[PDB]
């Protein structure tokens, strides 16, 4: 079987549609929620939301897969 785009679940339980959810002006909503409630770090959320448009795909992927 197998399709594209693919639903992705990370080692830490983040969910997004790959690659579409990483090619947008905003970060995937799961990552924003994770930084706010899981890490209790709204500062990180505000800064990722600000850097994201300027972030290359490699770095967005790095964040998405490891956050």
């Amino acid at each position: 079987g197998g399709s594209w785009p693919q639903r992705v679940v990370t080692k830490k339980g983040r969910t997004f549609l790959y690659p579409n959810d990483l090619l947008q002006t905003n970060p995937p909503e799961s990552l924003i929620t994770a930084l706010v409630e899981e890490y209790q770090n709204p500062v990180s959320a505000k800064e990722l939301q600000a850097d994201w448009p300027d972030m290359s795909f490699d770095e967005r992927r790095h964040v998405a897969m490891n956050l």
Partner: nanobody, 116 residues
Framework: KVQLQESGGGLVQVGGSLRLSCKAS????????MGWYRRAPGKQRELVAS???????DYGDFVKGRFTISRDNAENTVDLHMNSLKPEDTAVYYC????????????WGQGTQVTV
């Protein structure tokens, strides 16, 4: 893509000084922590020195005022000036960058050998 290039290691005998340099390639996140960890043979990885984008420094216990950590954000680099080195300081020194100061996003350098 973030690549971390390390340089400035090598041997210097006891009482000497070294400069470790690490340049972070790729995106310059608005806030980040940069620093160095070390691993001595058979031992467990230790924090040597770290510094945020705001300017605060954190040193391991053993440093004891011997080391100075500086950062030039323009070129997105960080330099470690180590003085009065001793046999115990011989280890592999790894550079690290933590986007937004978070260990989960950490990039690692390939490590540079320092020998007394």
């Amino acid at each position: 893509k973030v690549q971390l290039q390390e340089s400035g290691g090598g041997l210097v005998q006891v009482g000497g000084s070294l400069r470790l340099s690490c340049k972070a390639s790729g995106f310059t996140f608005r806030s980040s922590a940069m620093g160095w960890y070390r691993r001595a043979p058979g031992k467990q990885r230790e924090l040597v020195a770290s510094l945020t984008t705001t300017g605060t420094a954190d040193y391991g216990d053993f440093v004891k005022g011997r080391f100075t950590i500086s950062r030039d954000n323009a070129e997105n680099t960080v330099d470690l000036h180590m003085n009065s080195l001793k046999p115990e300081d011989t280890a592999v020194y790894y550079c690290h960058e933590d986007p937004y100061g978070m260990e989960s996003l950490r990039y690692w350098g390939q490590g540079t050998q320092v020998t007394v």
